[PDB]
């Protein structure tokens, strides 16, 4: 009913307002130890809001889709052989979040398509085909997830604004550069640490 729908929309607006207010809340270190802190309450509100949106869409008899880039079908046209292409497309379009294939999946796809239709393809060419396809769709899936990240990043506070303050302050810029050196180093350190643990737990 029209009234019900209108009401639900009002409720959505309410939850949005509450979420914004919580987002502005300033947490001290104590509150960062709190299981009930503004951050967690915010998360809860977000869940409530999503469920509510579901109900709203079911009332309108429209899809519950939010228009996320990540729900768009990713085409694969990469080879001369539509059958291979089709298998690859079905592979990367599997239902759920965990769709991301490894090389083995791609190779197996190429092989099954090449066998089913008897394309008479040598293993070298089959392998190069699989490698190129795996690279293409792997990069595609990565960039799609990245796009999804930057599209949905931040909040109303980041909607307002903006120029990096370091561009007008050489001292701050210097500090940030030093910080970058430290960052790269510490990352390298933890990575190589576990690599070396692996090497010592080998020989």
């Amino acid at each position: 009913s029209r009234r019900q729908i209108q009401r639900l929309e009002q409720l959505l607006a309410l939850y949005v307002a509450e979420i914004r207010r919580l987002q502005e809340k300033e947490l001290d270190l104590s509150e960062l130890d709190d299981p009930d802190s503004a951050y967690l309450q915010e998360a809860r509100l977000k869940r409530k809001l999503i469920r509510l949106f579901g109900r709203l869409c079911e009332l309108k008899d429209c899809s519950s889709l939010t228009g996320r880039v990540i729900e768009q079908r990713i085409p694969y046209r990469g080879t001369r052989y539509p059958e291979v292409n089709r298998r690859i497309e079905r592979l990367i379009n599997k239902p759920g979040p965990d769709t991301f294939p490894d090389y083995g999946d791609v190779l197996r796809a190429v092989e099954k398509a090449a066998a089913r239709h008897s394309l008479g393809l040598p293993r070298q060419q089959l392998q190069l085909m699989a490698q190129d396809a795996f690279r293409d769709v792997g990069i595609r899936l990565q960039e799609r997830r990245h796009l999804d990240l930057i599209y949905n990043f931040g909040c109303h506070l980041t909607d307002d604004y903006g120029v990096d303050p370091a561009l007008s302050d050489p001292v701050l810029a210097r500090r940030l550069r030093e910080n970058r050196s430290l960052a790269m180093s510490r990352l390298d350190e933890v990575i190589s640490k576990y690599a070396m643990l692996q090497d010592k737990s080998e020989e």
């Binding site: 949005v16 090389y103 990245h146 690599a195």
Partner: protein, 89 residues
């Protein structure tokens, strides 16, 4: 009336794989180690979590993309390291 973009953002937030309290406490611990007393906008914590999960996932994606084997294959620390040297920065 709420626009779809807002709904999209909040939806993305509900999809994070790391528990939010342990993450919050990790941030707390780091601030303690840094000996910084500053407060934090709840929004800032959210930003940190979304970014951190993206960073980890990208790390695994890069490892995946650098492993060409096609045998049933287990990822180890050296694989991580290699992938970072190849696709990193």
């Amino acid at each position: 009336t709420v626009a779809l973009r807002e709904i999209r953002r909040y939806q993305k937030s509900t999809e994070l794989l790391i528990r939010k309290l342990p993450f919050q406490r990790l941030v707390r611990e780091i601030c303690q180690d840094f000996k910084t007393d500053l407060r934090w906008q709840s929004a800032a914590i959210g930003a940190l979590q979304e970014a951190a999960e993206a960073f980890l996932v990208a790390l695994f994606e890069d490892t995946n993309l650098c492993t060409i084997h096609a045998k049933r294959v287990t990822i180890f620390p050296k694989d991580i390291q290699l992938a970072r040297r190849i696709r990193g920065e």
